[PDB]
Symmetry: none
Subunit: 174 residues, 2 copies
Amino acid sequence: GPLGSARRLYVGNIPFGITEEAMMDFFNAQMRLGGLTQAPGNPVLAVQINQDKNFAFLEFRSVDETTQAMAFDGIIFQGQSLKIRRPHDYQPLPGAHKLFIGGLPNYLNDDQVKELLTSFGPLKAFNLVKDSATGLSKGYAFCEYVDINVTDQAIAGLNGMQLGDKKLLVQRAS
Amino acid sequence: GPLGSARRLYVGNIPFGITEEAMMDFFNAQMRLGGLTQAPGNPVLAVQINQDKNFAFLEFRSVDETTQAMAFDGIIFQGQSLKIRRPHDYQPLPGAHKLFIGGLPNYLNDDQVKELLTSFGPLKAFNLVKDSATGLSKGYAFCEYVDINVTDQAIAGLNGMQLGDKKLLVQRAS
């Protein structure tokens, strides 16, 4: 559900043969050295390793320390660059990363506007704002990417871009 | 398998007539005497002796204790100085020869993908990655050959291979 999986992280590319205790000790040490821990003690409570598919799940004692540990993505552990991700059934709340897109040509329809956006990744929400009586586009839209990490990429790739006689605006809607 | 040779050592210059039990007793006693054990009990599980060529292999219960026993090179047994070495197939960096196989037709199952790989020799590890929900192949797999010397020939033979619709990507997984 909406509040599920908030204290766990997926860790991929773990070093071959590593133990759960070693992984646990490494992350707890890094949390402390890196200044990511928010109270005395160990933020990582447990590590569950799948040796066959070479991945682990970390369980944290708190929601906010789980979030902080996302910053370890790519950290090198016994020669291996670790892949750190949210669990697949973790989701931010609806609208958390809604985008505003302004400066669109009024003659473009929904699908045409969406084509520009979906080049960065799939969308879980989209609406092109139209005049209700005439059905004509007002030249701005909102969207949300399935993968929320795509949000900053769309902004970086589209914001301030030339588009016809306009300069496109793409920013977080709140 | 990979770690299997991480728990063995070669012993040379063994005196004539020595038994496997006497050798096992000797090394367990040495490990305990040196304070080199990381748990109660016996670190050496088994000894295999070749009387004709005057050598033995030791098998240990743990990777760390095997590494500790490297310190016994030159140790005196029945008046003779023993030669202690890693097995020739010892892997200093574990997983160095794990392969990634990508671009597989998504209808192929475990045995079919293995049939492609085993033409170059027997595997010690294999897994085809599947969607846990549907049980359907994601179109990539990992493996490890029993003989790591075969690895580069497999890459040479399989990488870039046209497989019906598909082109295979075969490389060290890292």
